[PDB]
Write a protein that binds this ligand. Structure first.
Ligand SMILES: Cn1cc(-c2ccc(C(=O)Nc3cc(-c4ccccc4)ccc3N)cc2)c2cc[nH]c2c1=O
Length: 125
Protein backbone atom coordinates (compact mmCIF):
# COMPACT_ATOMS: atom_id res chain seq x y z
CA UNK A 1 0.00 0.00 0.00
CA UNK A 2 0.87 3.69 0.12
CA UNK A 3 2.06 3.28 3.73
CA UNK A 4 5.13 1.22 4.67
CA UNK A 5 5.08 -1.31 7.48
CA UNK A 6 5.79 0.51 10.74
CA UNK A 7 9.37 0.55 12.05
CA UNK A 8 10.47 -2.47 14.04
CA UNK A 9 10.08 -2.09 17.80
CA UNK A 10 11.24 -5.46 19.17
CA UNK A 11 14.91 -6.54 19.30
CA UNK A 12 14.53 -10.23 20.17
CA UNK A 13 18.21 -11.22 20.37
CA UNK A 14 19.48 -8.11 22.15
CA UNK A 15 20.05 -8.56 25.91
CA UNK A 16 17.90 -6.39 28.14
CA UNK A 17 19.85 -3.79 30.10
CA UNK A 18 18.90 -0.52 31.71
CA UNK A 19 20.96 2.62 31.65
CA UNK A 20 20.47 5.89 33.53
CA UNK A 21 20.08 7.70 30.23
CA UNK A 22 17.51 5.26 28.83
CA UNK A 23 15.51 5.55 32.06
CA UNK A 24 15.59 9.31 31.63
CA UNK A 25 14.57 9.08 27.97
CA UNK A 26 11.52 6.98 28.83
CA UNK A 27 10.40 8.40 32.17
CA UNK A 28 11.24 12.08 31.57
CA UNK A 29 11.64 12.83 27.85
CA UNK A 30 9.11 10.53 26.20
CA UNK A 31 6.60 10.85 29.03
CA UNK A 32 6.65 14.67 28.89
CA UNK A 33 6.22 14.83 25.12
CA UNK A 34 3.62 12.03 25.03
CA UNK A 35 1.30 13.93 27.38
CA UNK A 36 1.75 17.32 25.68
CA UNK A 37 -1.33 18.95 24.16
CA UNK A 38 0.37 18.89 20.73
CA UNK A 39 1.50 15.23 20.79
CA UNK A 40 -1.30 13.79 18.67
CA UNK A 41 0.12 14.25 15.11
CA UNK A 42 3.25 12.47 16.32
CA UNK A 43 1.93 9.52 18.37
CA UNK A 44 1.73 7.08 15.44
CA UNK A 45 3.15 6.68 11.93
CA UNK A 46 1.94 9.16 9.33
CA UNK A 47 -0.98 7.59 7.47
CA UNK A 48 -0.44 8.96 3.97
CA UNK A 49 -3.73 7.45 2.78
CA UNK A 50 -6.03 9.00 5.38
CA UNK A 51 -4.11 12.29 5.33
CA UNK A 52 -3.97 12.38 1.50
CA UNK A 53 -0.20 12.85 1.42
CA UNK A 54 0.55 10.56 -1.56
CA UNK A 55 4.14 11.81 -1.90
CA UNK A 56 4.96 11.61 1.82
CA UNK A 57 6.92 8.38 1.66
CA UNK A 58 8.57 9.58 -1.56
CA UNK A 59 10.16 12.49 0.33
CA UNK A 60 10.56 10.86 3.77
CA UNK A 61 13.06 8.01 3.55
CA UNK A 62 13.21 7.25 7.32
CA UNK A 63 9.72 7.39 8.86
CA UNK A 64 9.66 8.00 12.59
CA UNK A 65 7.06 8.79 15.24
CA UNK A 66 6.69 8.84 19.02
CA UNK A 67 4.53 5.70 19.13
CA UNK A 68 7.45 3.81 17.64
CA UNK A 69 9.89 5.51 20.03
CA UNK A 70 7.68 4.69 23.01
CA UNK A 71 7.48 1.02 22.03
CA UNK A 72 11.22 0.88 21.40
CA UNK A 73 11.94 2.28 24.87
CA UNK A 74 9.36 -0.02 26.51
CA UNK A 75 10.89 -3.02 24.72
CA UNK A 76 14.51 -2.00 25.47
CA UNK A 77 15.10 -1.92 21.70
CA UNK A 78 17.83 0.74 21.87
CA UNK A 79 21.39 -0.20 22.77
CA UNK A 80 22.10 3.37 23.88
CA UNK A 81 20.47 6.73 24.49
CA UNK A 82 21.93 8.30 21.35
CA UNK A 83 19.94 5.96 19.09
CA UNK A 84 16.76 7.16 20.77
CA UNK A 85 17.79 10.83 20.51
CA UNK A 86 18.46 10.21 16.80
CA UNK A 87 14.93 8.87 16.34
CA UNK A 88 13.44 12.01 17.94
CA UNK A 89 15.63 14.16 15.68
CA UNK A 90 14.52 12.17 12.62
CA UNK A 91 10.84 12.62 13.55
CA UNK A 92 11.27 16.40 13.75
CA UNK A 93 13.40 16.56 10.59
CA UNK A 94 10.73 14.67 8.64
CA UNK A 95 8.11 17.20 9.70
CA UNK A 96 10.27 20.20 8.78
CA UNK A 97 11.39 18.97 5.37
CA UNK A 98 7.95 17.77 4.22
CA UNK A 99 5.43 20.35 5.47
CA UNK A 100 5.26 24.04 4.68
CA UNK A 101 7.01 26.20 7.33
CA UNK A 102 3.73 27.87 8.29
CA UNK A 103 1.76 24.64 8.70
CA UNK A 104 0.18 24.24 12.15
CA UNK A 105 1.77 20.77 12.26
CA UNK A 106 5.22 22.38 11.97
CA UNK A 107 4.41 24.88 14.71
CA UNK A 108 3.30 22.00 16.94
CA UNK A 109 6.51 20.08 16.21
CA UNK A 110 8.57 23.16 17.11
CA UNK A 111 6.91 23.38 20.52
CA UNK A 112 7.60 19.69 21.14
CA UNK A 113 11.16 19.99 19.91
CA UNK A 114 11.88 22.88 22.29
CA UNK A 115 10.66 20.74 25.19
CA UNK A 116 12.69 17.77 23.91
CA UNK A 117 15.85 19.90 23.73
CA UNK A 118 15.25 21.35 27.19
CA UNK A 119 14.98 17.85 28.63
CA UNK A 120 17.96 16.48 26.65
CA UNK A 121 20.19 19.30 27.90
CA UNK A 122 19.71 17.72 31.37
CA UNK A 123 20.43 14.14 30.28
CA UNK A 124 22.42 12.47 33.10
CA UNK A 125 25.88 11.09 32.44
C1 LIG B 1 3.82 14.18 11.38
N1 LIG B 1 2.63 14.64 10.65
C2 LIG B 1 1.38 14.34 11.12
C3 LIG B 1 0.24 14.74 10.51
C4 LIG B 1 -1.08 14.39 11.10
C5 LIG B 1 -2.15 15.28 11.06
C6 LIG B 1 -3.35 14.97 11.69
C7 LIG B 1 -3.51 13.75 12.36
C8 LIG B 1 -4.76 13.37 13.09
O1 LIG B 1 -4.76 12.44 13.88
N2 LIG B 1 -5.82 14.19 12.91
C9 LIG B 1 -7.01 14.17 13.68
C10 LIG B 1 -7.19 15.18 14.63
C11 LIG B 1 -8.39 15.26 15.35
C12 LIG B 1 -8.61 16.37 16.30
C13 LIG B 1 -7.54 16.93 16.99
C14 LIG B 1 -7.73 18.03 17.82
C15 LIG B 1 -8.98 18.58 17.98
C16 LIG B 1 -10.06 18.03 17.30
C17 LIG B 1 -9.88 16.94 16.47
C18 LIG B 1 -9.37 14.29 15.12
C19 LIG B 1 -9.17 13.28 14.20
C20 LIG B 1 -7.99 13.20 13.46
N3 LIG B 1 -7.81 12.20 12.53
C21 LIG B 1 -2.44 12.87 12.39
C22 LIG B 1 -1.24 13.18 11.77
C23 LIG B 1 0.38 15.52 9.28
C24 LIG B 1 -0.54 16.11 8.38
C25 LIG B 1 0.19 16.76 7.42
N4 LIG B 1 1.52 16.58 7.69
C26 LIG B 1 1.67 15.83 8.83
C27 LIG B 1 2.85 15.41 9.49
O2 LIG B 1 4.00 15.66 9.13
Amino acid sequence: SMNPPPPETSNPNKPKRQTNQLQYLLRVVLKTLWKHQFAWPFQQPVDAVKLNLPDYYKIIKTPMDMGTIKKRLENNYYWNAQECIQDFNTMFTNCYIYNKPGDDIVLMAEALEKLFLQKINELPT
